[PDB]
Amino acid sequence: AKNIMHGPPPFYPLEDGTAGEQLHKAMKRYAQVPGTIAFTDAHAEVNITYSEYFEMACRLAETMKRYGLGLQHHIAVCSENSLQFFMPVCGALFIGVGVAPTNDIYNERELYNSLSISQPTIVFCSKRALQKILGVQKKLPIIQKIVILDSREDYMGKQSMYSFIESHLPAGFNEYDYIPDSFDRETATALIMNSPKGVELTHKNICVRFSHCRDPVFGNQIIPDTAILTVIPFHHGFGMFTTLGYLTCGFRIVLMYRFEEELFLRSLQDYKIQSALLVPTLFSFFAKSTLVDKYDLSNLHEIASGGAPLAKEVGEAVAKRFKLPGIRQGYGLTETTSAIIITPRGRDDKPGACGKVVPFFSAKIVDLDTGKTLGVNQRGELCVKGPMIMKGYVNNPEATSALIDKDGWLHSGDIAYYDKDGYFFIV
């Protein structure tokens, strides 16, 4: 059992409270420093500050509670990456209402299948997504309300966030007196994510990610005026749990609803970005790109994927283009909330490794035929155990049991080994 790798203790002890309570507390502090930027739309050039974001999140929270939503209800958010995407997400976490980030590029059948699993009472959607959501609403009576995200006025006969709020929020609502709900973080559904199944993640699951993201070895240091650029879809686990964590760190999250090479590189330079978050196939793109050295990227210290493992050689080619000593890798699955193996900050001598096991977690390598635990440098199936492991697949205890054994180990399906320094490598 010296052959099981364990993460170390977190730098800071695990904070109490639900995920909504932790997020509210951080956002409320950043809201009181005027001009602190939460999100920036790289296409439109519009910035939204933490005081704006905190105020909208508290108003949506109270509005949804007055409308009648509680722990037994869910909501969906279906939208391209945008400034408004996270408003209903934060608000719902405040009040213990499960949130379902729902791919906005799904076709009708796919969307129906996703929303059939999550059963949302309210869908928040963008203008682009409305027509398909209206189609699916005809087949899913649970969907009683649609609210438009990216509109300042009512659109196509649907209320905007502002008009929805106005319909329910009492006169004199003060966001600074608002208090998020408390409930059992171990069991309360925080998010339902897609993996074609629903992955139910709990508040405790997100609270542990919130430890890692603010950890000086396993996350990012909270340093004022840190900006990050992400082109990861907010409905992917890799995009949701990096972005949500950044809100707890008070960072400026620069977004793009569409990838374009020049806009991406210009944004990195002009916004003095410190970390850039890519999807795996954009690593391959950036290994081809020669435009990169026309830009001043002297502020950039990190390229990451949120836990999608990368081939060693593509990782090294990208790092070289961007004049960095390496990529910051990780390994996670939607079913593990986020990355449970992460490269320790500032360490770039293990190219090819996905990193070390995160605090609160254990990882082992097993023989594929036997289940037998293997030792150092020996290849087998990667299994992981810890408090970011999903509650289970929505409505599918058979698939849950096939993935996670009776001792709490999730069997990832990947082949891996670890080395003498405790670094893991996916084969």
TrEMBL record:
Coiled coil: none annotated. It comes from Lampyris turkestanicus. One of its GO terms (cellular component) is peroxisome. Residues 31-393 form the AMP-dependent synthetase/ligase domain. Keywords: ATP-binding, Luminescence, Magnesium, Metal-binding, Monooxygenase, Nucleotide-binding, Oxidoreductase, Peroxisome, Photoprotein. One of its GO terms (biological process) is bioluminescence. This is Luciferin 4-monooxygenase. GO terms for molecular function: ATP binding; CoA-ligase activity; metal ion binding; Photinus-luciferin 4-monooxygenase (ATP-hydrolyzing) activity. The keyword Nucleotide-binding applies. Its cofactor is Mg(2+). It is found in: Peroxisome. It is an enzyme of class 1 (oxidoreductase). It catalyses: firefly D-luciferin + ATP + O2 = firefly oxyluciferin + hnu + AMP + CO2 + diphosphate. Signal peptide: none annotated. Its main location: other. The keyword Flavoprotein does not apply. Its EC number is 1.13.12.7. Belongs to the ATP-dependent AMP-binding enzyme family.
